[PDB]
Design a protein around this ligand. Structure first.
Ligand code: HEM
Ligand SMILES: *[C@@H]1O[C@H](CO)[C@@H](O[C@@H]2O[C@H](CO)[C@@H](O)[C@H](O)[C@H]2NC(C)=O)[C@H](O)[C@H]1NC(C)=O
Ligand SMILES: [Ca+2]
Ligand SMILES: [Ca+2]
Ligand SMILES: [Mn+2]
Length: 357
């Protein structure tokens, strides 16, 4: 087909997503892998995972836009703390681009947001999800303090995800920060390159922890290897769950396998996301609008490296059957501060709308 902008799309139904992509970029993303983009990528996951095979349809419909359709319900569950911001930022587009369902909107937005992160893959995007569903039940969102067994069971029950797919999905923590784990500090990065979709997170979680970014008494948080922060440049935080998955016999080798394996990591994430994005739907009933997802930003192609002040001596390895690669170390005696803004500064407030959530 061909859209009113000359763009030759696959199916005429996909044409509506072109104006939406432009509006999302211009209004809330500004073509960067920033705060607003990160929040949306997280929403994509919280919307999709609220489904349960064992409990049945009444428990939740998966990737159905329930967070937007029932804004006063799920956003208020403990495990969803902080999701309100992404919901309120997306509602205005729902009302505007009213030919696209809340569910399609959520998934597409995440695909657009991710394309702003260098190294991220171009996600598959299928459209046609219904604009009607039910509010999900509490307890279907995995938490930081959960054990590996509980986590793996949750993903299996949601959509038959194997442990390999679960680890692959955590590649998103390479462009993630925390605002609610510790209430004394904001935007504490999970890896040293929070604006880059690379393998640093897999490497950095394997390093010995030496301190904490803020308080040392937070549920679901463990010692970080790069806690130093000054002003707005908050230090790195480490989640119990990420730590646990990096050292459990079931997932240890998978986790290590992604260190310095950029192409493998990106492809595995794309694969796992294809499944996640259609939870609660039959993919044979959705149209393929992938050619409408923006081309992602390319990476520089540099290998993973130990950040300044850490080295091979600081690794806590758990995979006995695979050789850890030889990586270089960035020069310096002390830890460098992790930039709060992608441009380098400390002042870069994102757009935020008031809403019902
Ligand atoms: C065992 C599974 C997971 C757990 C327990 C978990 C936990 C968390 C926690 C505690 C935060 C901090 C939020 C805050 O306090 O502000 C976070 C952030 C985030 N997570 Fe996860 N996560 C999991 C899986 C995923 C998956 C599968 C995705 C998506 C594909 C994802 C994407 C994100 C993103 C992008 C953020 C950052 C939001 C921002 O920087 O504003 N997470 N996660
Ligand atoms: C999907 O459902 C939502 C929720 O009912 C619809 O949102 C309304 O859209 C109109 C314009 O079409 C706005 O004036 C309303 O205020 C919206 N309601 C809310 C609560 O936000 C949306 O239009 C529906 N879209 C589709 C494609 O079915
Ligand atoms: Ca949902
Ligand atoms: Ca990163
Ligand atoms: Mn945040």
């Amino acid at each position: 087909a061909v859209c009113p902008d000359g763009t030759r799309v696959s199916h005429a139904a996909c044409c509506a997503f072109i104006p939406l992509a432009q509006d999302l970029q211009e209004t809330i993303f500004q073509n960067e892998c920033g705060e607003d983009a990160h929040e949306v990528i997280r929403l994509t996951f919280h919307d999709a995972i609220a489904i349960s095979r064992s409990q049945g349809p009444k428990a939740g419909g998966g990737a159905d836009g329930s967070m937007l359709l029932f804004p006063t319900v799920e956003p208020n569950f403990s495990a969803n703390n902080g999701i309100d911001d992404s919901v309120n930022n997306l509602i205005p587009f729902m009302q505007k681009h009213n030919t696209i369902s809340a569910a399609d909107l959520v998934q597409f937005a995440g695909a657009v947001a991710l394309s702003n992160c260098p190294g991220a893959p171009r996600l598959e995007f299928l459209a046609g999800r219904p604009n009607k569903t039910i509010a999900a039940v509490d307890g279907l969102i995995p938490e930081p303090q959960d054990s590996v067994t509980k986590i793996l069971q949750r993903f299996e029950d949601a959509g038959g995800f194997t442990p390999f797919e679960v680890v692959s999905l955590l590649a998103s923590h390479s462009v993630a920060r925390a605002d609610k784990v510790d209430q004394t500090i904001d935007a504490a990065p999970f890896d040293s390159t929070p604006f880059t979709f690379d393998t640093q997170v897999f490497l950095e979680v394997l390093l010995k922890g030496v301190g904490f970014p803020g308080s040392a008494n937070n549920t679901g948080e463990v010692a970080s290897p790069l806690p130093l922060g000054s002003g707005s440049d908050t230090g790195e935080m480490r989640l119990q769950s990420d730590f646990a998955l990096a050292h459990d016999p079931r997932t240890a080798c998978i986790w290590q396998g992604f260190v310095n394996e950029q192409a493998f990591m990106a492809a595995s994430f794309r694969a796992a996301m294809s499944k996640l994005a259609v939870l609660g739907h039959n993919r044979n009933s959705l149209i393929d609008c992938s050619d409408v997802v923006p081309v992602p930003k390319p990476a520089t192609g540099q290998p993973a490296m130990f950040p300044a002040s850490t080295g091979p001596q600081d690794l806590e390895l758990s995979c006995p059957s695979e050789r850890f690669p030889t990586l270089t170390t960035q020069p310096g005696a002390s830890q460098s501060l992790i930039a709060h803004c992608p441009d380098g500064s400390m002042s870069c407030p994102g757009v935020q709308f008031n809403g019902p959530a």
